[PDB]
Each structure stands twice: as C-alpha cells, then as structure tokens.
Design a binder for this molecule. Structure first.
Ligand code: CYT
Length: 73
DNA sequence: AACCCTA
C-alpha cells in the first residue's frame, strides 16, 4: 500500500513539528518511515501544507507523532 | 512565543 494524506498546519505551529535544525521532523521521518513534505513558506498564507506519503502503518504513525507534538503547543 | 527540516 502507498497513498498520500494532506493537512494544513498554521505557521506558528510548524516550528514545533520541525524542531531546531529539523531534528524533530527528521525523527518523525525515521520512526514512521513515511515520506513527509512540509511546503516552503507562502507569504500570503497563514499555514503550511504538509503531505504524508507511504504505507498505511507509516502514514498512521507519522500522523500520531505529529499529533503528539501539536498536543504540547 | 513559535524551532525551517526535506526536497
Ligand atoms: N487550531 C489548530 C491546531 C492544530 N492544528 C490545526 O489544524 N488547527
């Protein structure tokens, strides 16, 4: 199985997901095995597009890990 | 109050 899930995260919350030097998001990539793409900043947008791609288990785990981070902030 | 990776 290989599909993509799309979400949108406000600009002020994406730093918590990424972490300093991208350490947090890199960890989420490594643990989940999912391909994760956070869009470049868009000056006329309040949020960032995030795409999670991979197996059903990988996408689910990536989403779980993202929610853990969001639930702190 | 807001970490900037991968690609
Ligand atoms: N208020 C919100 C917090 C986290 N994620 C959202 O999409 N919205």
């Amino acid at each position: 199985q290989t599909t993509s899930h799309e979400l949108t995260i406000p600009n002020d919350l994406i730093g918590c997901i990424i972490g300093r030097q991208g350490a947090k998001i890199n960890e989420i990539r490594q643990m989940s095995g999912a391909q994760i793409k956070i869009a470049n900043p868009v000056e006329g947008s309040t949020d960032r597009q995030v795409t999670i791609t991979g197996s059903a288990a990988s996408i689910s785990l990536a989403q779980y890990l993202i929610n853990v981070r969001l639930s702190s902030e």
